[PDB]
């Protein structure tokens, strides 16, 4: 009933003006006690309150960020815009779009949150390459397929097999930044070594900054 | 060792004020039931004072 899905840019240059949005539906910003705010959380620490607007055009800001955080509302299209300047390499976090239906219930329902990294590098293309079992792939019986992707700076990325059709039992576990400066993640979807040539496996990668909807089928490759 | 009097140590729900709770069944301790035979991951109620 409450879809606080965030949208907008994910990569930003140092010392710039960032703009985040989160489209909401299922409610309004006119009932008494309503409120839409922004909450971020750096990976590895606790959460910190950024701002919280109300139904009476009251824009409450954080005591530390009193000048950068300038949040505005848009009731005509049900969108909340958050503006912040002075992009320091400390603002990297997952910004959650919050909803305050009443004062007693502090942020009852949340959204999903997007990870905005603060660096100076640009975006790179995907490296979709299937991982078929080989002569040295039999260790205990597990020979699951994969399409490991690397050589990409923007961390937020998902793996969707057959556009979300054969995604039953997917164990795609992301990773962190390596020593070179490029992320990497593989798919650990539970598919036995028997049913690999019958079904079609196309992991549709979804790159948000680069907009690269490349596709690559997975088949049993020989030597 | 005066083993006549006994008490209650292993419980799961707090009793109500002024309530007589005579529990004799085998307390399911640990994480898995054992159905009488204590063995491991179990404890028998009505322990001794000493």
């Amino acid at each position: 009933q409450v879809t606080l899905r965030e949208s907008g840019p994910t990569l930003v240059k140092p010392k710039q003006t960032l703009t985040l949005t989160c489209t909401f539906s299922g409610f309004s910003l006119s009932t008494p006690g309503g409120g839409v705010g922004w909450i971020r959380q750096p990976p590895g620490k606790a959460l910190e309150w950024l701002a919280l607007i109300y139904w009476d055009d009251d824009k409450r800001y954080s005591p530390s960020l009193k000048s950068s955080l300038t949040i505005t509302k848009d009731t005509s299209k049900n969108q909340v815009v958050l503006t912040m300047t002075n992009m320091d390499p400390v603002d990297t976090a997952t910004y959650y779009c919050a909803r305050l239906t009443a004062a007693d219930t502090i942020f009852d329902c949340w959204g999903q949150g997007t990870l905005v990294t603060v660096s100076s590098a640009s975006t790179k293309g995907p490296s979709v390459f299937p991982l078929a079992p080989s002569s040295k792939s039999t260790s205990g019986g597990t020979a699951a397929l994969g399409c490991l992707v690397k050589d990409y700076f923007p961390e937020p990325v998902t793996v969707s097999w057959n556009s979300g059709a054969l995604t039953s039992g997917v164990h795609t576990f992301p990773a962190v930044l390596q020593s070179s400066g490029l992320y990497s993640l593989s798919s650990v979807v539970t598919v036995p070594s028997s049913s690999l040539g019958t079904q079609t496996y196309i992991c549709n990668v979804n790159h948000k900054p680069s907009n690269t909807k490349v596709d690559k089928r997975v088949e049993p490759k020989s030597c | 060792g005066n083993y006549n009097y006994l008490y209650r140590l292993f419980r799961k729900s707090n009793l109500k004020p002024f309530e007589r709770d005579i529990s004799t069944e085998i307390y399911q301790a640990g994480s898995t039931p054992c159905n009488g035979v204590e063995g491991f991951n179990c404890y028998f109620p009505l322990q001794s004072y000493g």
Binding site: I39, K45, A46, L47, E48, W49, L52, S62, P63, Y96, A103, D104, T105, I106, F107, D108, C109, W110, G111, Q112, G113, S127, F129, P130, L131, A132, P133, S134, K136, S137, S139, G140, T142, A143, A144, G146, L148, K150, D151, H171, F173, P174, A175, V176, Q178, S179, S180, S184, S186, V188, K221, S222, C223 | K12, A29, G30, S31
Partner: protein
């Protein structure tokens, strides 16, 4: 800014109390207090909005009670669903505090042996100068163990300091690893060792 202990973990079945501090310096009377159960990998979800009153739908035995200045979550039976974090939030005099970190784990779980499976690169990235030797390490509950590489030459990280901190549906963390190799060299190397040391099963 109120704090809270790091680990209040206990054995399943028994009851534990996550007593996060009060810090009456900023809070006035501790009127409204909420608790979150953010699952690792997803967004935080509310389980109790008032001091004791819990919202409908998602509520089995979650309860709280504040005596004079601080509250605490009381969970006794529901201790075998997931080892998520517990943040306590309260209204301050000028802002909203979210507390600190508390990684509540499940003390005592089957010590299943880890799984080591080699995944050599196929004939898709070997010619593309992107040869990678991916090694799948999963099937172990306690945290993410450290991978060991003893492939007859030297212990080289080459991109192992990740531990893949992502929990699956079976509540089993997997320490998946990778390996940065040369553009095209398959026969010049050998089988790289993935003998990971796990608590209980060092092999």
């Amino acid at each position: 800014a109120l704090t809270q202990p790091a680990s209040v973990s206990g054995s399943p079945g028994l009851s534990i109390t996550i007593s996060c501090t009060a810090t009456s310096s900023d809070v006035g009377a501790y009127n409204y207090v909420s608790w979150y159960q953010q699952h690792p990998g997803q967004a935080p979800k509310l389980m109790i909005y008032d001091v004791s009153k819990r919202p409908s739908g998602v509520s089995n035995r979650f309860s709280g009670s504040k005596s004079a200045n601080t509250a605490s979550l009381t969970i006794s039976g529901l201790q075998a669903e997931d080892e998520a974090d517990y943040y306590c939030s309260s209204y301050t005099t000028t802002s909203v505090v979210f507390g600190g970190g508390t990684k509540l784990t499940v003390l005592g779980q089957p010590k299943a042996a880890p799984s080591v499976t080699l995944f050599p690169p196929s004939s898709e990235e070997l010619q593309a100068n992107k040869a990678t030797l991916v090694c799948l390490i999963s099937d172990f509950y306690p945290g993410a163990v450290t991978v060991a590489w003893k492939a007859d030459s030297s212990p080289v990280k080459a991109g192992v300091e990740t531990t893949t901190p992502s929990k699956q549906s079976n509540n089993k963390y997997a320490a998946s690893s990778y390996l940065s190799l040369t553009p095209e060299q398959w026969k010049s190397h050998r089988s790289y060792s993935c003998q990971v040391t796990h608590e209980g099963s060092t092999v």
